[PDB]
Amino acid sequence: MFVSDFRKEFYEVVQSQRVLLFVASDVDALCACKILQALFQCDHVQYTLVPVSGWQELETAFLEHKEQFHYFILINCGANVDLLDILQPDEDTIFFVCDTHRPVNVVNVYNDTQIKLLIKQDDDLEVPAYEDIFRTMRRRQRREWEARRRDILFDYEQYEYHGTSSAMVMFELAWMLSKDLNDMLWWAIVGLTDQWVQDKITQMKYVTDVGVLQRHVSRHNHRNEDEENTLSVDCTRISFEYDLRLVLYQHWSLHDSLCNTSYTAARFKLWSVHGQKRLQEFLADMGLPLKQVKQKFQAMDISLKENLREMIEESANKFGMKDMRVQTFSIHFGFKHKFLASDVVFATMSLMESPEKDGSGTDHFIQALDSLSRSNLDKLYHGLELAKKQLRATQQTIASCLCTNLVISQGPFLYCSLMEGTPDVMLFSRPASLSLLSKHLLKSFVCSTKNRRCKLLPLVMAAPLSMEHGTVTVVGIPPETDSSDRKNFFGRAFEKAAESTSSRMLHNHFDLSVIELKAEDRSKFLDALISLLS
Amino acid sequence: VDLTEPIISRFDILCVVRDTVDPVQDEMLARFVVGSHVRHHPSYGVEPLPQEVLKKYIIYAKERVHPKLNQMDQDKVAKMYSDLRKESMATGSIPITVRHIESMIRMAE
Amino acid sequence: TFSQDYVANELTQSFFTITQKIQKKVTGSRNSTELSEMFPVLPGSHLLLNNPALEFIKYVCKVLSLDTNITNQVNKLNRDLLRLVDVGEFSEEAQFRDPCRSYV
């Protein structure tokens, strides 16, 4: 059931109790965890925090901790499955679920005692009515009703997508409690920007949520500040920006930013040998010297920078890149620390999905979670360096795929596969980084190919995962049209193929459109996918 | 040859050209040579490029293109090198050292 | 002497067809927990047999490579059907070894 008021029916309940946070491995989950940690630390709520990277380790952690905790909070996990069946809880536990995944499972919706959904009722939700889903001529009509149930429930469960950011939900809770600090607002901004960077939401919804956050930014910017009374440089200042879509461009050279941003790399076709001359034509049209463009942005001459954003937009419009600007936010504090929300997103994401083998994925979660606090600015800057490396590896992998023509149109969907031992495959073995790679590669492919047919197809990408057990990670991506609503069917198409072929499919990641598959079964799995999508 | 192993091993490609008698090849070679002397007066099957086009092609291929090796089926080349070393030790015809492996990578590129 | 080549051509057709058939069947057997479980066990067994079409090709090609000195068509059949299986030549799984540890 949906929690109507977060303050009354969730926070004031768990405020008196020991609580267990299960937190998923993504930047929005991390930001929601930071906000909720801050509230609990204000109120001396003795919580325990456990990272979980998948369903099986969530089940393991719950089996470990179910004896000692009666109140659980799941951040960016649980809403899209039957948690009662998955975890098999005791009759009197409570699971609060703050999760962006949609559609919410009908058992989660209509469970009225144990599952409590911290989900805004005004999200994109169309739940079927209870009587349509739950309980001679009489039994004939019973069977007819069951057939109608199967039809309706397939129509409900078909398309998976994402709702409002969990960080924004927790910030609204903090605002209702009136314990909303400026760093909490920054964490909310970073969660929404994580959704936008990973393309989990439409541009319309992102602009609407930015419009929501602008008012909170104005309120915080007038708590103790106006045009004639101003604070120390120590204090944090969040500012609304109509900034550039380039990635990390204030922390490395504008050349590296243009080369390693997905949009401009795809448009200029910089994987190709000819694309560098297109980029040089763009820079010459702007009138920026190449030495300045290749110099680091902080060391670039200041006479080039104070109208650079509108210069970029003006040149991009006549080059056909009609939307180089983006509505975003920045944070300043001290004399020299300045970050865009995209910069913090990429740094934290890289700290999570780092290619380092030392430690473990939970240690990398811990590094990412530490980097979001300003007591660990060294960790944030290290994450920025790792993000530069990750972006470069992404472009090299895209270039390899397109140059070798690994992307082949398998009728209903394009298909690509990474190969074991090839460069950076270990970096992209992790499902989140693989999803980002597949999205960037699909944009690059759509800009590359001249066929009108290929510009509309979705894409399925495979990569090696295991040799001790011999498996691969497979992801499904929707088409990259500007008309797209950012919903995909691959979460259900994969399991329909898997059950049609009786394939050894394992379903550990929280997104249904990412799976693990035995390397032998991929042939018949793909055959079933072509047969299914038709 | 009268050269020694350190200099012999530094040459990736090592060619022997012989001038043995073979009448049909001699006739074809003679016709080609006399035809060349006719063609260049002051006035295989596949056809070549013009040399201007070849020069432009060469400089483009050298400066604007950079091959990158993803895989090369390591077992094949490793076994080849191992028994090439065996036969070189057997006959003494040519030292093989380790440079021939890297010559394989260079020639592929 | 010369009929070796004729039977080699007949095998170039039939061996291909048979390997396709057993490949499609055995990889479609849904009861296979692992295809290594498919193989029988005898007191001489030691090899980690894994993918029955490959073992089939290896054993057939061993007997063909030794029942005639004309190994050229047998090596061509190896390079054909191993590539049909998409297993690489010169890998260790492509090499024959005696499945029986004989002891007298």
XYZ file of C-alpha atoms in Angstrom:
747
model
C 0.000 0.000 0.000
C 1.043 3.586 -0.693
C 2.135 5.794 2.201
C -0.007 8.927 2.014
C 2.109 11.081 4.368
C 5.804 10.298 4.783
C 6.105 12.289 8.018
C 3.190 10.694 9.866
C 3.008 7.063 8.716
C 6.696 6.332 7.913
C 9.147 8.649 9.659
C 7.335 9.035 12.975
C 6.959 5.235 13.024
C 10.589 4.292 12.356
C 11.866 7.201 14.491
C 11.276 5.162 17.668
C 12.790 1.915 16.345
C 15.902 0.146 15.189
C 15.926 0.221 11.386
C 17.817 -1.657 8.665
C 18.622 0.123 5.390
C 19.111 -2.025 2.309
C 20.638 0.343 -0.265
C 21.033 -0.419 -3.966
C 24.238 0.417 -5.857
C 23.334 3.531 -7.823
C 23.900 7.236 -7.307
C 20.237 8.080 -6.681
C 20.123 5.333 -4.045
C 23.305 6.714 -2.484
C 21.858 10.234 -2.336
C 18.603 9.039 -0.761
C 20.683 7.062 1.735
C 22.719 10.176 2.574
C 19.580 12.251 3.204
C 17.963 9.536 5.321
C 21.207 8.990 7.241
C 21.309 12.701 8.037
C 17.734 12.650 9.370
C 18.358 9.525 11.466
C 21.591 10.983 12.842
C 19.724 14.144 13.819
C 17.119 12.090 15.709
C 19.545 9.461 17.161
C 17.774 6.639 15.322
C 20.001 3.578 15.784
C 20.028 2.345 12.192
C 22.174 -0.224 10.422
C 23.136 0.242 6.761
C 23.798 -2.689 4.404
C 24.710 -2.267 0.717
C 23.052 -4.748 -1.627
C 24.093 -5.153 -5.269
C 21.340 -7.601 -6.238
C 18.372 -9.734 -5.284
C 20.350 -12.719 -4.002
C 22.553 -10.653 -1.689
C 19.455 -8.752 -0.555
C 17.958 -12.132 0.375
C 21.199 -13.142 2.105
C 21.328 -9.917 4.127
C 17.666 -10.286 5.077
C 18.261 -13.877 6.195
C 21.178 -12.628 8.290
C 19.326 -9.683 9.885
C 15.639 -10.704 10.023
C 15.871 -11.937 13.621
C 17.102 -8.604 15.015
C 15.148 -5.968 13.015
C 11.403 -5.448 12.592
C 11.572 -2.316 10.380
C 13.394 -2.393 7.039
C 13.875 0.341 4.425
C 14.713 -0.641 0.836
C 16.264 2.164 -1.241
C 15.960 1.685 -5.020
C 14.984 -1.968 -4.686
C 11.944 -4.129 -4.011
C 9.006 -2.237 -5.516
C 8.960 -4.146 -8.829
C 8.831 -7.684 -7.324
C 6.718 -9.577 -4.788
C 8.800 -8.901 -1.682
C 6.683 -11.256 0.442
C 7.456 -14.197 -1.843
C 11.087 -13.167 -2.383
C 12.057 -12.684 1.278
C 9.473 -14.875 3.084
C 9.258 -12.521 6.090
C 7.715 -13.029 9.489
C 4.093 -11.939 9.802
C 4.895 -8.741 11.779
C 7.876 -7.132 10.040
C 7.454 -3.921 8.025
C 9.145 -3.153 4.689
C 9.253 0.499 3.703
C 10.119 0.685 -0.003
C 11.491 3.902 -1.538
C 12.140 2.824 -5.117
C 12.043 4.477 -8.530
C 11.333 1.271 -10.483
C 7.947 0.977 -12.195
C 5.426 -0.674 -12.543
C 4.927 -1.449 -8.854
C 4.047 -5.097 -8.303
C 0.323 -5.533 -7.683
C 0.972 -7.630 -4.572
C 3.084 -4.765 -3.226
C 0.313 -2.288 -4.055
C -2.584 -4.246 -2.529
C -0.723 -5.647 0.482
C -2.252 -3.476 3.208
C -0.307 -4.532 6.339
C 3.385 -5.270 5.663
C 4.640 -3.570 2.466
C 4.530 0.239 2.642
C 5.437 2.097 -0.546
C 7.171 5.477 -0.177
C 6.024 6.434 -3.669
C 4.317 9.640 -4.758
C 0.729 8.919 -5.786
C 0.956 11.490 -8.622
C 3.682 9.512 -10.423
C 3.033 7.811 -13.773
C 0.951 5.038 -12.187
C -1.977 3.086 -13.658
C -2.605 0.133 -11.337
C -5.387 -2.302 -12.354
C -8.329 -2.425 -9.985
C -8.312 -5.028 -7.221
C -11.387 -6.930 -8.421
C -9.843 -7.405 -11.883
C -6.767 -9.157 -10.419
C -7.827 -10.828 -7.145
C -10.619 -13.013 -5.780
C -21.320 -24.828 -15.613
C -21.891 -21.184 -16.541
C -20.513 -19.919 -13.215
C -17.140 -21.641 -13.605
C -17.162 -20.713 -17.301
C -17.344 -17.045 -16.312
C -14.663 -17.736 -13.687
C -12.337 -18.983 -16.437
C -13.277 -16.001 -18.620
C -12.415 -13.643 -15.752
C -9.083 -15.429 -15.311
C -8.326 -14.955 -19.020
C -9.185 -11.253 -18.726
C -6.886 -11.114 -15.690
C -3.999 -12.559 -17.701
C -4.615 -10.030 -20.490
C -4.857 -7.030 -18.138
C -1.891 -8.057 -16.002
C 0.342 -8.589 -19.035
C -0.674 -5.123 -20.249
C 0.278 -3.772 -16.811
C 3.575 -5.648 -16.356
C 4.829 -5.226 -19.949
C 6.760 -1.931 -19.910
C 9.303 -1.169 -17.175
C 10.396 2.403 -16.461
C 11.351 4.789 -13.634
C 9.395 7.296 -11.547
C 10.342 10.209 -9.319
C 13.811 10.150 -7.771
C 14.113 8.532 -4.350
C 16.497 11.318 -3.354
C 13.753 13.826 -4.181
C 11.262 11.762 -2.152
C 13.563 11.766 0.872
C 14.203 15.485 0.411
C 10.461 16.128 0.473
C 10.398 14.168 3.731
C 13.249 16.331 5.052
C 11.374 19.470 3.986
C 8.211 18.328 5.774
C 10.294 17.646 8.889
C 12.009 21.049 8.364
C 15.437 19.465 8.747
C 16.399 20.063 5.105
C 20.012 21.208 4.963
C 21.611 22.641 1.842
C 23.729 19.516 1.392
C 20.502 17.486 1.503
C 19.144 19.648 -1.313
C 22.397 19.037 -3.195
C 21.986 15.279 -2.723
C 18.433 15.534 -4.097
C 19.804 17.410 -7.114
C 22.467 14.735 -7.601
C 19.832 11.984 -7.506
C 17.719 13.667 -10.172
C 20.838 14.289 -12.247
C 21.717 10.598 -11.892
C 18.337 9.751 -13.413
C 18.940 12.248 -16.221
C 22.531 11.141 -16.929
C 21.471 7.490 -17.083
C 18.443 8.400 -19.272
C 15.996 6.694 -16.911
C 13.451 9.528 -17.392
C 12.124 11.654 -20.227
C 13.390 15.176 -20.842
C 9.932 16.556 -20.009
C 9.920 14.877 -16.596
C 13.500 15.992 -15.953
C 12.610 19.605 -16.767
C 9.564 19.372 -14.487
C 11.634 18.003 -11.597
C 14.258 20.705 -12.193
C 11.429 23.223 -11.962
C 10.483 21.691 -8.617
C 14.066 21.860 -7.331
C 14.566 25.476 -8.479
C 12.127 26.703 -5.830
C 13.928 24.825 -3.049
C 17.200 26.282 -4.345
C 15.738 29.800 -4.168
C 14.460 29.193 -0.624
C 17.881 27.984 0.514
C 19.573 30.888 -1.295
C 17.380 33.344 0.674
C 17.501 31.660 4.105
C 20.358 34.012 5.172
C 21.323 35.804 1.953
C 20.236 38.561 -0.426
C 21.786 41.108 -2.801
C 23.379 43.143 0.055
C 23.979 40.655 2.915
C 26.150 37.674 1.973
C 27.685 34.692 3.747
C 31.244 33.464 4.169
C 32.989 31.663 1.330
C 32.926 28.608 3.631
C 29.166 28.179 3.209
C 27.744 26.148 0.335
C 25.923 27.991 -2.460
C 23.705 26.035 -4.858
C 22.974 27.868 -8.118
C 20.672 27.112 -11.025
C 22.617 26.872 -14.294
C 21.594 26.782 -17.941
C 24.894 25.072 -18.552
C 26.509 22.999 -21.306
C 25.784 19.331 -21.979
C 29.526 18.536 -22.121
C 30.774 16.070 -19.509
C 33.292 17.132 -16.827
C 34.357 20.055 -18.993
C 35.400 22.253 -16.038
C 37.854 19.571 -14.791
C 39.721 18.682 -18.010
C 40.242 20.308 -21.397
C 37.362 21.396 -23.602
C 38.894 19.155 -26.279
C 38.653 16.074 -24.053
C 35.118 17.099 -23.094
C 34.008 17.375 -26.723
C 35.776 14.105 -27.559
C 34.386 12.085 -24.627
C 30.861 13.506 -24.371
C 28.419 11.001 -25.842
C 26.313 13.552 -27.738
C 29.116 15.420 -29.509
C 31.179 12.268 -30.060
C 28.160 10.636 -31.705
C 27.350 13.680 -33.848
C 30.904 14.374 -35.037
C 31.529 10.609 -35.478
C 34.893 10.860 -33.742
C 35.246 7.073 -33.746
C 35.792 7.591 -37.483
C 39.020 9.054 -38.838
C 37.082 11.782 -40.670
C 35.204 13.043 -37.594
C 38.157 14.900 -36.089
C 38.095 17.305 -39.034
C 34.386 17.902 -38.386
C 35.248 18.782 -34.785
C 38.059 21.066 -35.965
C 35.586 22.779 -38.302
C 33.257 23.305 -35.329
C 36.050 24.799 -33.220
C 37.185 27.039 -36.091
C 33.592 28.217 -36.536
C 33.597 29.131 -32.850
C 36.968 30.853 -33.202
C 38.690 29.104 -30.265
C 42.453 28.459 -30.700
C 43.237 24.754 -30.616
C 45.974 25.314 -28.026
C 43.441 26.931 -25.693
C 40.882 24.209 -26.451
C 43.434 21.499 -25.588
C 44.598 23.318 -22.448
C 42.866 22.492 -19.172
C 39.712 24.540 -18.656
C 40.904 26.156 -15.422
C 44.121 27.208 -17.221
C 42.298 28.458 -20.336
C 42.437 32.197 -20.995
C 39.572 33.938 -19.207
C 38.704 36.119 -22.219
C 37.450 32.965 -24.003
C 35.207 31.707 -21.187
C 32.772 34.430 -20.083
C 30.493 33.903 -23.126
C 31.528 30.332 -23.968
C 28.127 28.795 -23.224
C 26.198 31.021 -25.628
C 29.018 30.739 -28.186
C 28.684 26.941 -28.002
C 24.908 27.168 -28.386
C 25.130 29.585 -31.328
C 27.638 27.433 -33.225
C 25.808 24.215 -32.331
C 22.534 25.554 -33.732
C 24.074 26.151 -37.171
C 25.836 22.767 -36.920
C 22.479 21.072 -36.207
C 22.981 20.318 -32.482
C 19.899 22.247 -31.419
C 20.019 21.446 -27.653
C 23.604 21.818 -26.416
C 22.309 23.613 -23.292
C 20.758 21.865 -20.294
C 18.955 23.091 -17.188
C 21.100 21.894 -14.276
C 22.663 23.066 -11.002
C 26.094 23.779 -9.530
C 27.512 23.968 -5.998
C 30.251 26.339 -4.795
C 32.071 26.435 -1.476
C 35.397 27.740 -0.325
C 37.485 29.593 -2.884
C 38.124 26.896 -5.521
C 35.616 24.023 -5.136
C 32.999 24.105 -7.915
C 31.042 21.149 -9.316
C 28.163 20.571 -11.675
C 25.606 17.983 -10.608
C 26.683 15.929 -13.622
C 30.277 16.088 -12.363
C 29.306 14.720 -8.959
C 27.145 12.061 -10.657
C 29.990 10.836 -12.856
C 32.508 10.871 -9.993
C 30.287 8.880 -7.614
C 29.233 6.498 -10.393
C 32.867 5.814 -11.294
C 33.756 5.209 -7.645
C 30.965 2.619 -7.567
C 31.768 0.896 -10.883
C 35.564 1.225 -10.562
C 37.666 -1.343 -12.494
C 39.958 -1.909 -9.488
C 40.104 -5.555 -8.404
C 41.382 -4.817 -4.888
C 38.745 -4.855 -2.177
C 35.229 -5.608 -3.374
C 32.098 -4.071 -4.830
C 30.885 -3.210 -1.336
C 34.181 -1.429 -0.656
C 33.625 0.550 -3.856
C 30.095 1.350 -2.649
C 31.696 2.627 0.551
C 34.132 4.821 -1.390
C 31.256 6.263 -3.426
C 29.138 6.904 -0.324
C 32.038 8.643 1.426
C 32.721 10.838 -1.611
C 29.279 12.494 -1.349
C 30.250 14.188 1.956
C 32.451 17.284 1.876
C 34.774 15.786 4.505
C 35.971 13.465 1.658
C 36.693 15.949 -1.126
C 39.864 13.984 -1.872
C 37.652 10.980 -2.614
C 35.456 13.139 -4.855
C 38.452 14.371 -6.876
C 39.788 10.817 -7.150
C 36.359 9.852 -8.462
C 36.605 12.626 -11.048
C 39.914 11.201 -12.295
C 38.358 7.726 -12.454
C 35.432 9.237 -14.380
C 37.808 10.682 -16.972
C 39.341 7.221 -17.383
C 35.884 5.614 -17.629
C 34.695 8.057 -20.304
C 37.837 7.500 -22.376
C 37.406 3.720 -22.117
C 33.758 4.101 -23.160
C 34.734 5.949 -26.327
C 37.469 3.432 -27.173
C 34.982 0.570 -26.766
C 32.373 2.336 -28.923
C 35.019 2.907 -31.594
C 36.015 -0.768 -31.503
C 32.398 -1.930 -31.814
C 31.517 0.378 -34.703
C 34.794 -0.070 -36.606
C 34.636 -3.875 -36.343
C 30.861 -3.846 -37.117
C 29.975 -5.913 -34.057
C 26.562 -4.184 -34.042
C 24.442 -6.360 -36.363
C 20.726 -5.848 -36.986
C 18.935 -8.995 -35.780
C 15.601 -8.084 -37.322
C 13.501 -6.902 -34.323
C 16.595 -5.579 -32.503
C 20.227 -4.673 -33.032
C 22.720 -7.010 -31.368
C 26.224 -6.456 -30.028
C 28.677 -8.517 -28.001
C 31.875 -7.752 -26.139
C 34.599 -10.404 -26.325
C 36.660 -11.820 -23.474
C 40.199 -10.468 -23.250
C 39.571 -7.439 -25.460
C 40.406 -4.009 -23.959
C 38.357 -2.665 -21.018
C 35.879 -5.573 -21.025
C 36.620 -6.047 -17.324
C 35.701 -2.400 -16.730
C 32.396 -2.905 -18.575
C 31.641 -6.342 -17.066
C 29.535 -4.686 -14.324
C 25.835 -4.269 -15.310
C 25.456 -0.524 -14.603
C 28.519 0.428 -16.644
C 27.370 -2.004 -19.337
C 23.963 -0.299 -19.494
C 25.628 3.100 -19.896
C 27.931 1.678 -22.580
C 24.998 0.215 -24.497
C 23.057 3.495 -24.378
C 26.045 5.541 -25.575
C 26.825 2.975 -28.273
C 23.226 3.014 -29.500
C 23.322 6.802 -29.857
C 26.646 6.520 -31.707
C 25.244 3.800 -33.987
C 22.109 5.814 -34.764
C 24.248 8.814 -35.705
C 26.626 6.598 -37.710
C 24.278 4.560 -39.889
C 22.553 6.077 -42.919
C 19.736 3.506 -43.148
C 16.386 4.901 -42.022
C 15.360 1.464 -40.712
C 18.309 1.081 -38.334
C 17.697 4.454 -36.643
C 14.483 3.123 -35.004
C 15.547 -0.280 -33.628
C 16.268 -1.197 -29.984
C 19.575 -2.820 -29.018
C 20.609 -5.903 -27.037
C 24.203 -6.091 -25.787
C 26.077 -9.020 -24.245
C 29.370 -9.073 -22.340
C 31.384 -11.745 -20.485
C 30.698 -12.063 -16.754
C 32.035 -15.402 -15.479
C 34.535 -18.106 -16.393
C 34.398 -20.044 -13.113
C 30.709 -20.558 -14.028
C 30.737 -19.508 -17.704
C 28.064 -16.800 -17.984
C 27.454 -13.467 -19.719
C 25.608 -10.285 -18.765
C 22.894 -9.283 -21.257
C 21.162 -5.881 -21.294
C 18.239 -4.592 -23.354
C 17.894 -0.948 -24.421
C 14.908 0.825 -26.091
C 15.201 2.912 -29.276
C 17.054 6.239 -29.122
C 14.466 8.464 -30.812
C 13.798 11.917 -29.396
C 10.109 10.908 -29.339
C 10.930 8.039 -26.955
C 9.160 7.822 -23.589
C 12.007 5.790 -21.983
C 10.031 2.577 -21.486
C 11.294 -0.835 -22.613
C 9.861 -4.357 -22.810
C 13.096 -6.344 -22.556
C 12.577 -7.282 -18.903
C 9.582 -9.412 -19.893
C 10.865 -10.375 -23.350
C 13.990 -11.893 -21.773
C 12.020 -14.120 -19.406
C 9.539 -15.114 -22.124
C 12.483 -16.210 -24.276
C 14.124 -17.894 -21.279
C 11.035 -19.954 -20.414
C 10.303 -20.710 -24.081
C 13.819 -22.194 -24.393
C 14.200 -23.395 -20.763
C 17.447 -21.411 -20.706
C 19.647 -21.033 -17.617
C 18.746 -17.386 -17.004
C 19.595 -15.803 -13.637
C 17.890 -12.570 -12.668
C 19.973 -10.942 -9.938
C 20.073 -7.264 -10.969
C 17.256 -5.011 -9.764
C 16.371 -4.012 -13.351
C 14.462 -6.705 -15.223
C 16.108 -5.689 -18.532
C 19.520 -6.906 -17.238
C 20.133 -10.649 -16.843
C 22.860 -13.243 -16.404
C 22.855 -16.095 -18.918
C 24.867 -19.263 -19.437
C 27.199 -18.699 -22.385
C 25.911 -21.800 -24.204
C 22.232 -20.783 -24.086
C 22.672 -17.367 -25.747
C 22.124 -18.873 -29.213
C 18.678 -20.326 -28.511
C 17.851 -17.347 -26.270
C 18.491 -14.984 -29.185
C 16.532 -17.253 -31.540
C 13.569 -17.056 -29.170
C 13.960 -13.274 -28.947
C 13.768 -12.871 -32.738
C 10.770 -15.226 -32.783
C 9.090 -13.326 -29.933
C 9.575 -9.740 -31.093
C 8.767 -10.891 -34.657
C 75.856 -15.530 -45.703
C 78.962 -14.703 -43.529
C 76.820 -12.475 -41.253
C 76.405 -13.412 -37.582
C 73.395 -14.143 -35.408
C 72.890 -10.701 -33.724
C 72.552 -8.924 -37.085
C 70.686 -11.781 -38.806
C 68.043 -11.842 -36.064
C 67.445 -8.077 -36.366
C 65.903 -8.516 -39.853
C 62.214 -9.400 -39.647
C 61.890 -10.487 -43.296
C 64.831 -12.453 -44.699
C 64.663 -13.086 -48.447
C 66.793 -15.315 -50.681
C 66.774 -14.511 -54.419
C 68.249 -17.082 -56.812
C 69.033 -16.965 -60.533
C 68.559 -20.645 -61.392
C 67.812 -21.719 -64.960
C 64.164 -22.383 -65.854
C 63.408 -21.973 -69.613
C 59.702 -21.036 -69.471
C 60.298 -18.463 -66.725
C 63.354 -17.216 -68.621
C 61.246 -16.709 -71.754
C 58.528 -14.847 -69.847
C 61.120 -12.728 -68.017
C 62.846 -11.882 -71.305
C 59.549 -10.839 -72.882
C 58.733 -8.683 -69.845
C 62.167 -7.028 -69.901
C 62.111 -6.262 -73.628
C 58.542 -5.004 -73.293
C 59.706 -2.748 -70.464
C 62.480 -1.349 -72.652
C 59.848 -0.676 -75.329
C 57.382 0.885 -72.869
C 59.940 3.160 -71.185
C 61.604 4.460 -74.352
C 62.054 8.278 -74.462
C 59.292 8.313 -77.158
C 50.315 -12.305 -60.744
C 47.316 -11.149 -62.802
C 46.126 -8.223 -60.681
C 46.727 -4.685 -61.991
C 48.724 -2.094 -59.946
C 47.903 1.435 -58.789
C 49.454 4.491 -60.463
C 52.503 5.475 -58.443
C 51.178 8.961 -57.617
C 48.020 7.355 -56.222
C 50.185 4.830 -54.371
C 52.242 7.591 -52.734
C 49.094 9.407 -51.598
C 47.646 6.093 -50.373
C 50.854 5.298 -48.471
C 51.075 8.597 -46.621
C 47.363 8.492 -45.755
C 47.711 4.909 -44.509
C 50.791 5.769 -42.438
C 49.658 9.066 -40.881
C 45.822 9.056 -40.817
C 45.382 5.336 -39.892
C 46.641 3.430 -36.827
C 45.881 -0.317 -36.481
C 45.035 -1.768 -33.063
C 45.255 -5.472 -32.206
C 42.272 -6.956 -30.341
C 43.142 -10.660 -30.658
C 45.365 -12.878 -32.796
C 44.546 -16.508 -31.790
C 47.546 -16.933 -29.514
C 47.670 -20.756 -29.597
C 48.359 -20.892 -33.346
C 51.302 -18.477 -33.290
C 52.701 -19.876 -30.024
C 52.811 -23.450 -31.336
C 54.240 -22.187 -34.630
C 57.055 -20.355 -32.840
C 57.819 -23.339 -30.594
C 58.354 -25.840 -33.405
C 59.972 -23.219 -35.667
C 62.518 -22.918 -32.855
C 62.844 -26.717 -32.838
C 63.540 -26.929 -36.581
C 65.914 -23.948 -36.459
C 67.874 -25.722 -33.731
C 67.813 -28.859 -35.895
C 69.129 -27.421 -39.177
C 71.044 -24.345 -37.990
C 69.723 -22.365 -40.951
C 68.668 -19.174 -39.136
C 68.485 -18.037 -35.469
C 64.929 -17.403 -34.312
C 65.463 -15.983 -30.746
C 62.275 -14.135 -29.631
C 62.247 -11.420 -32.334
C 60.307 -13.523 -34.858
C 57.190 -13.433 -32.638
C 57.215 -9.644 -32.545
C 57.885 -9.675 -36.290
C 54.601 -11.580 -36.638
C 52.746 -8.847 -34.741
C 54.442 -6.118 -36.808
C 53.646 -7.767 -40.149
C 50.008 -8.259 -39.140
C 49.754 -4.566 -38.256
C 45.309 -45.841 -53.098
C 43.213 -43.260 -54.932
C 39.844 -44.262 -53.418
C 40.950 -42.593 -50.157
C 40.158 -39.248 -51.788
C 36.723 -40.411 -52.971
C 35.710 -41.544 -49.496
C 37.198 -38.310 -48.132
C 34.799 -36.335 -50.344
C 31.878 -38.558 -49.310
C 32.858 -37.857 -45.701
C 33.181 -34.123 -46.475
C 29.441 -34.262 -47.152
C 28.236 -36.887 -44.656
C 30.450 -35.992 -41.671
C 29.314 -32.360 -41.948
C 25.648 -33.392 -42.012
C 26.059 -35.818 -39.094
C 27.915 -33.296 -36.936
C 25.199 -30.696 -37.557
C 22.559 -33.259 -36.569
C 24.188 -34.404 -33.322
C 25.117 -30.809 -32.408
C 21.548 -29.536 -32.780
C 20.148 -32.564 -30.919
C 22.549 -32.755 -27.973
C 22.633 -29.004 -27.345
C 18.821 -29.082 -27.467
C 18.585 -31.842 -24.843
C 16.946 -29.981 -21.938
C 17.775 -32.729 -19.408
C 21.493 -31.822 -19.634
C 22.494 -30.153 -16.376
C 26.009 -30.011 -17.820
C 27.028 -31.511 -21.149
C 30.001 -33.023 -19.294
C 27.444 -35.139 -17.401
C 26.353 -36.622 -20.757
C 29.419 -38.887 -21.075
C 29.729 -42.482 -19.761
C 32.237 -43.557 -17.109
C 34.533 -46.594 -17.199
C 37.506 -47.542 -14.978
C 39.906 -45.985 -17.521
C 38.077 -42.638 -17.653
C 40.029 -39.478 -16.815
C 39.313 -36.771 -19.434
C 37.008 -33.829 -18.686
C 34.844 -34.456 -21.740
C 32.553 -31.469 -22.247
C 30.870 -31.007 -25.664
C 30.011 -34.320 -27.400
C 30.165 -33.155 -31.044
C 33.776 -32.097 -30.464
C 34.744 -35.460 -28.932
C 32.936 -37.187 -31.814
C 34.921 -35.176 -34.379
C 38.184 -35.791 -32.518
C 37.759 -39.567 -32.312
C 36.596 -39.934 -35.933
C 39.431 -37.743 -37.182
C 41.974 -39.692 -35.121
C 40.991 -42.979 -36.737
C 40.904 -41.286 -40.151
C 44.319 -39.681 -39.598
C 45.850 -43.084 -38.771
C 44.095 -45.411 -41.265
C 45.789 -43.580 -44.164
C 49.032 -41.691 -44.681
C 47.022 -39.102 -46.688
C 46.254 -36.806 -43.766
C 45.517 -33.735 -45.927
C 41.767 -34.257 -46.287
C 41.524 -35.334 -42.638
C 43.211 -32.101 -41.544
C 40.853 -30.205 -43.851
C 37.915 -32.006 -42.213
C 39.306 -30.986 -38.821
C 39.617 -27.346 -39.886
C 36.091 -27.504 -41.338
C 34.175 -29.148 -38.506
C 36.068 -27.495 -35.641
C 35.115 -24.162 -37.228
C 31.559 -25.484 -37.585
C 31.670 -26.113 -33.817
C 33.358 -22.665 -33.450
C 36.207 -24.207 -31.437
C 39.683 -23.056 -32.400
C 42.361 -25.231 -33.936
C 45.630 -25.520 -31.947
C 43.728 -25.155 -28.659
C 44.216 -28.002 -26.208
C 40.567 -29.094 -26.341
C 40.998 -29.640 -30.104
C 43.878 -32.098 -29.534
C 43.152 -35.806 -29.253
C 44.103 -37.693 -26.114
C 43.371 -41.337 -25.351
C 40.142 -41.365 -23.257
C 41.250 -44.612 -21.538
C 44.105 -44.734 -19.020
C 45.148 -48.251 -19.977
C 46.917 -50.250 -17.261
C 48.222 -53.801 -17.738
